[PDB]
Amino acid sequence: NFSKAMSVAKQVFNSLTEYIQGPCTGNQQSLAHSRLWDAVVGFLHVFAHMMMKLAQDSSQIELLKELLDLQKDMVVMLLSLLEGNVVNGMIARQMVDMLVESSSNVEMILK
């Protein structure tokens, strides 16, 4: 059930990248003024805690692989929102606040 839920989440993140990749400024601006950040904050929290819990066990290696590739597709989506950004841009400043809110969960990932 965890595997299939992540499988769907991979496709939905990959679709969102397609809409913005090749700077589509309007599509990038739309995803800014939306609830995408809330889904981004929530996914980081689940990612961080599931990483450490599943790293421990030797029977969760396969599930940890699914969580690993899913998080890679998510950050690729965040990078796509930054294509063509200017300094002090709307999309970049709103992206900082998301990282500020999820600072604790980012720290657990980086270690």
3-state secondary structure 69-96: HHHHHHHHHHHHHCCCCCCCCHHHHHHH
Residue among 35, 41, 2, 3 nearest 16 (CA):
35
Distance of CA 74 to the CA centre of its chain: 3
Residue among 91, 98, 79 nearest 40 (CA):
98
Residue ranges for the binding site?
18
Residue ranges for the binding site for Ca(2+)?
18
Residue with tokens 């500020």, as numbered in its chain: 100
- Tally Cβ neighbours within 10 Å of residue 45: 14
> What kind of experiment solved this structure?
cryo-EM
DSSP string, 33-57: TSSHHHHHHHHHHHHHHHHHHHHH-
Helices (H) and strands (E) in the chain, counts: 6, 0
